[PDB]
From a paper:
Cereblon (CRBN) is the substrate receptor of the CRL4CRBN E3 ubiquitin ligase and is a central player in targeted protein degradation. In our laboratory, we established the single-domain bacterial homologue cereblon isoform 4 from Magnetospirillum gryphiswaldense (MsCI4) for structural ligand-binding studies, which shares 35% sequence identity and <1 Å r.m.s.d. over 100 Cα atoms with the thalidomide-binding domain (TBD) of human CRBN. We grow MsCI4 crystals in complex with thalidomide, and then exchange thalidomide for the ligand in question in subsequent soaking experiments.
The IMiD iberdomide, which is about to enter Phase III clinical trials for different forms of MM, consists of an extended tail formed by a morpho­linomethyl-benzyl group connected via an oxy group to phthalimidine, which is attached to a classical glutarimide moiety. Most interestingly, the orientation of the protruding moiety was different in all three chains. While the glutarimide moiety shows the canonical interactions with the tri-Trp pocket, the phenyl ring is harboured in a channel formed by Glu76, Phe77 and Pro51 of MsCI4. In chain C, the orientation of the molecule could partially be influenced by crystal contacts with Ile70, Gly71 and Ala72 of the symmetry chain B. However, the protruding moiety in chain B adopts a very similar orientation, albeit being solvent-exposed with the nearest symmetry atoms more than 7 Å away, suggesting that this overall conformation is not the result of crystal-packing effects.
Residue numbers in the entry: 16 to 123
The structure:
Amino acid sequence: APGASIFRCRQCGQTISRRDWLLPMGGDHEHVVFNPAGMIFRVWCFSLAQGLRLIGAPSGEFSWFKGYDWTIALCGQCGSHLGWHYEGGSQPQTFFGLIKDRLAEGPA
Ligand SMILES: O=C1CC[C@H](N2Cc3c(OCc4ccc(CN5CCOCC5)cc4)cccc3C2=O)C(=O)N1
Ligand SMILES: [Zn+2]
């Protein structure tokens, strides 16, 4: 009964990621960040995620992670904004920054 091992979309229950997949970027999986619109996000970095829909082409504008371009990551099921896919960087080349409070943690 591994009780807190997967992350689902809080809105619809789509399978998104796993506690096992948390990635400490610059020493911490958690990054508290603000966009140009002044919205605060508690971002959890994951090496891997699924069940998302990545919108458009990458942009480096206002990237919170040096060397990485982002794409908006929506829940592929309900279209809720869950965070961003990061690419074009180094070690790793790619990862997901997901908004912690938009995910529900629960058993495998
Ligand atoms: O890593 C990341 C992931 C993406 C994330 N971003 C960028 C971003 C935007 O970025 C496009 C954009 C940015 C700025 C403007 C207009 N300016 C002009 C001067 O500054 C204030 C208003 C228009 C469009 C537009 C809307 C939301 C976000 C958002 O959440 C972020 O910040 N860092
Ligand atoms: Zn959803």
